[PDB]
Amino acid sequence: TTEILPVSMTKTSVDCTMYICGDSTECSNLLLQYGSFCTQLNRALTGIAVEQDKNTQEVFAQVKQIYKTPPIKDFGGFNFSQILPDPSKPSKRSPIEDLLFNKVAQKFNGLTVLPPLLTDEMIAQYTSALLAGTITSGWTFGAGPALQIPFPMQMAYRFNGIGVTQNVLYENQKLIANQFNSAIGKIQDSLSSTPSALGKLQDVVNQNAQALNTLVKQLSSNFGAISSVLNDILSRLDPPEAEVQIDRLITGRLQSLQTYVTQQLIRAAEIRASANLAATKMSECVLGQSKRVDFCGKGYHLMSFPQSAPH
Amino acid sequence: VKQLSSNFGAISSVLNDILSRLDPPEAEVQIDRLITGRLQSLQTYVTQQLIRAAEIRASANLAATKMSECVLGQSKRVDFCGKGYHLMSFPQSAPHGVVFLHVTYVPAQEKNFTTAPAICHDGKAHFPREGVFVSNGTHWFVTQRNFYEPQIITTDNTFVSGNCDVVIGIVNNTVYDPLQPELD
Amino acid sequence: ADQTGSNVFQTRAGCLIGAEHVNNSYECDIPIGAGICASYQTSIIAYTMSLGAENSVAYSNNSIAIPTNFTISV
Ligand SMILES: *[C@@H]1O[C@H](CO)[C@@H](O)[C@H](O)[C@H]1NC(C)=O
Ligand SMILES: *[C@@H]1O[C@H](CO)[C@@H](O)[C@H](O)[C@H]1NC(C)=O
Ligand SMILES: *[C@@H]1O[C@H](CO)[C@@H](O)[C@H](O)[C@H]1NC(C)=O
Ligand SMILES: *[C@@H]1O[C@H](CO)[C@@H](O)[C@H](O)[C@H]1NC(C)=O
Ligand SMILES: *[C@@H]1O[C@H](CO)[C@@H](O)[C@H](O)[C@H]1NC(C)=O
User: Annotated site (Cleavage), which positions (chain A)?
Assistant: First the structure.
């Protein structure tokens, strides 16, 4: 089967003074009398940004070392070429990780988009150490030192853990290998076709883009003032009478910035609940065999494999 | 507390100073700027505490799960309680939290052997009940998977099922019969 | 101008001044971004973080590794 979980979202950092005022000294001076609303917003949006780099660490960085699969690929008939990294292609992403990356820093009014600490060529190298260490070791590399074992022999432990003896595998080893190969083969087709397969990762990106559009598209609202441009209010109004009109845009834009940060704090707690389930699904199903019903798949769990998606 | 000293657009941040030097009709238009400002400073505090109190309620639900499943039992879930094979756990109380001391079992000092899926004796494939087949270069033994304790191969630790033709990698070796030597 | 120099180095996250680039790779000490980390080893240095010690299990179709001891970890 296949289960797609989002683990992190984009790390944005909106600055008030450039957003609310935007190079106006008169506006900026009126802003310090509101106290520290905006030392709060920067602090809030920074706690969200350093979570997204902790969500990725706890999911992928499960292995102490970087294990390598042997150059000769003879795993008893099982064929892992669809999940193993492709040497020919420049980015070393496996054939299934290529679909997941093709199916799913902008300057603006104070908006910044910080880059993630782990590049996608480092995330796709944790997922090939967690996957080339579960092929050559089993569950033994998540407990202590990695202990090699033949795959048709560490797959007969996994029948032995679901209540099926070892005879059923060694006597049906060639049939089971074909069923595993063709099952992996149809995973790529389902993702390639059906243009809603990812789904869960897309709605996270769309919701983060709708939030920024509503924030930017609300810098052109009067909020009760005569104009949405500070320059016009300063240019054609006498200063003590422009003071009251600027203060209307201050309170309007400061409220449009607070609802943005508030819904991101609520949204960042949804991803942390999905970045904590993916760290649990990696520990309990990739680094072992799970007895929990329907936790990993619909059936009696045998093994699981991680593949990295953009977020 | 530090934001009780902000004008919020009013002439001052002290209610005593505004009431002293302003008339009642236009004092109210300066109090409202403090009413609105101090009210908004209390809503953003309560709102972030509602979000912050739901982070603790998720760690206080994980700590109650770790107590029930690891202190009041032995866990089979991987990496749930420590890095290793869980044995037992002990709770210690911290001021605003709990500390778990996870006793685990970490294997060490591994050495590598040669295996076989089965062993063909008398034209019948023999698979082990619990453990693996290993060879120390010359002789074949049945040892448990998580600790090297080799034993000779008898019919008490192996179960027979099928023929020697279907298994890929079956080896030829003798499976000692525990009762035949002591017959009569 | 808080103090543009000679150790000018361009990162993807920005561009870093005052830290020299080395071609090695260490464990991440101070995360800068886009795979770049900084550390103090004497001057400030800026490198690309190392994911972990390289390893390669000696896989073979008729070989297993079985532990002969253990360790109790708290
Ligand atoms: C694995 O399957 C692919 C087709 O998806 C095939 O090209 C490849 O040869 C197979 N692996 C081996 C070792 O034959
Ligand atoms: C595996 O065992 C063989 C002999 O049994 C030995 O020569 C080889 O070095 C071992 N491989 C290791 C320890 O990685
Ligand atoms: C292997 O085990 C047998 C049985 O205990 C022993 O006689 C022998 O010395 C061991 N080593 C080798 C290399 O056969
Ligand atoms: C292991 O692979 C070798 C080829 O490298 C082959 O000759 C041998 O029969 C294989 N052993 C098993 C048990 O499949
Ligand atoms: C590092 O590599 C670059 C080119 O890859 C080279 O110019 C430089 O001399 C090397 N050493 C240091 C210390 O930068």
Answer: 93-94
Distance from CA of C23 to the nearest CA of A (A): 17
Amino acid at B93: S
From chain B, pick out residues whose CB is under 8 angstroms from the CB of C56.
none
Which site among A149, A173, A308 would you substitute to test the C interface, given the most C Cβ atoms closer than 10 Å to its Cβ? Answer: A149
**Contacts of residue A163, Cβ cutoff 8 Å, sequence gap at least 6:** A300
Residue A5 has φ and ψ, to the nearest 5°, of: -125, 135
- DSSP helix, strand, coil percent of chain B (3-state; round to 5): 30, 30, 40
Residue A271 CB burial class (10 angstroms; 0-12, 13-18, ≥19) = buried
End-to-end CA gap in chain B: 96
Is A43 in contact with A118 (CB distance < 8 Å)? no
Concatenate the DSSP letters of all residues of A80-103 into one string.
Answer: -TTTS--SSSTT---HHHHHHHH-
Report the separation in Å between the CA atom of B134 and the middle of ligand 2, taken as the mean of its atom positions.
13
Q: Report the distance separating Cα A219 and Cα A249, nearest Å.
A: 9
User: What are the tokens at A190?
Assistant: 């389902």
Whole-number Å distance between alpha carbons of A177 and A160? 17
The DSSP H or E segment spanning B134 is strand B132-135
- In angstroms, the CA A264 to CA A259 distance is 9
Method: cryo-EM
Neighbours of A238 (CB within 10 A): 7
Strands of the B124-128 sheet, one edge to the other: B158-160, B124-128, B119-121, B171-172
Q: Phi, psi at residue A32, to the nearest 5°?
A: -70, -15
Amino acid found at B110: E
Question: Could you say which DSSP state residue B42 is in?
Answer: H
β-pair type (B171-172, B119-121):
parallel
Q: Cα–Cα distance between B70 and B78 in angstroms, integer?
A: 12
Residue of A74, A75, A78, A173 to mutate, ligand 4, most atoms within 8 A of C-beta:
A74
Kindly state the helix (H) or strand (E) to which residue A240 belongs, with its residue range: helix A239-281
